[PDB]
Enzyme design. Sequence first.
Site, short mmCIF file in Angstrom:
data_model
loop_
_atom_site.label_atom_id
_atom_site.label_comp_id
_atom_site.label_asym_id
_atom_site.label_seq_id
_atom_site.Cartn_x
_atom_site.Cartn_y
_atom_site.Cartn_z
CB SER A 65 3.96 1.16 7.53
OG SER A 65 3.99 1.75 6.29
CG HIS A 102 -0.24 -0.13 2.56
ND1 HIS A 102 -0.21 1.14 3.22
CD2 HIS A 102 0.70 -0.57 3.12
CE1 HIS A 102 0.32 1.17 4.36
NE2 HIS A 102 0.74 -0.09 4.27
CG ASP A 110 -2.59 -6.03 2.43
OD1 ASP A 110 -3.08 -6.00 1.34
OD2 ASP A 110 -3.12 -6.14 3.44
#
Lengths: 151, 151
Positions: A103, A29, A51
């Site tokens: 992240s 993402h 993901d």
Amino acid sequence: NDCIFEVKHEGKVMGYACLVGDKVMKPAHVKGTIDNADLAKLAFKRSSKYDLECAQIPVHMKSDASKFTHEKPEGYYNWHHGAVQYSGGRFTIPTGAGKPGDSGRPIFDNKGRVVAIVLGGANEGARTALSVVTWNKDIVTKITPEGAEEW
Amino acid sequence: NDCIFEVKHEGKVMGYACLVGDKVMKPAHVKGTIDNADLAKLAFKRSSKYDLECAQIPVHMKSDASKFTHEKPEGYYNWHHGAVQYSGGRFTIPTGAGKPGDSGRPIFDNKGRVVAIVLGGANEGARTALSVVTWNKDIVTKITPEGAEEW
């Protein structure tokens, strides 16, 4: 330390990419391009169910690969922003530590082995819960608590 | 200490409710409502086979739930009114302790983990036998000795 490279988009920092085992791993993402010149020319594969994106490490950079395992006993672990405690099958940290854009951080073992990659989490009053992609024998799996939001 | 709430009716206390794991638990034969504004609006399931009702914990209160286990080795356990002895597969407490209206207290191990919820007891001269509900792997069970009376 040496296994982490930064991904930027239009001058802004968006995330990190980790060099674990024999593969280069990155959350899907996050947008942008990788700072390292050689890494940007590689081809990548995608799977929206997990993901994740991955590609094989080039030959001459393999010595920077970190070590890894799959055992996850109960106890205490550490990462860049403090300590993280694992008990009952969940990872938790004190509230308020950690901000959007972080992240892609690894979570380390006592002897330096890589066990997890952190992508987002859920927030409540006194504690927070992490959403993590981990692995096992020959497969990988995704752990997600209720109400989680991406970082 | 912090995970116990009171159930009231017309200004009087008849029992307690407890948060264990991720569910709220309440003996079936206790009437009334929950004093906390948020918990009182929850929908509950009912089962007269085990005298228990349960519901899901809302997100922001999860931090106050206790730990739980299923091993029950022989030894002594702690609760609100003193020490409790476990041997022969049965719970015993010295006579005189406990009165009607004190159902719903949890029973604690040496490390503070919840193993049972007390509902009533039997009458005997020297020592009192308890009627409790406990659990095992993926099942729940009711243990009721002869002569028990509701509390």
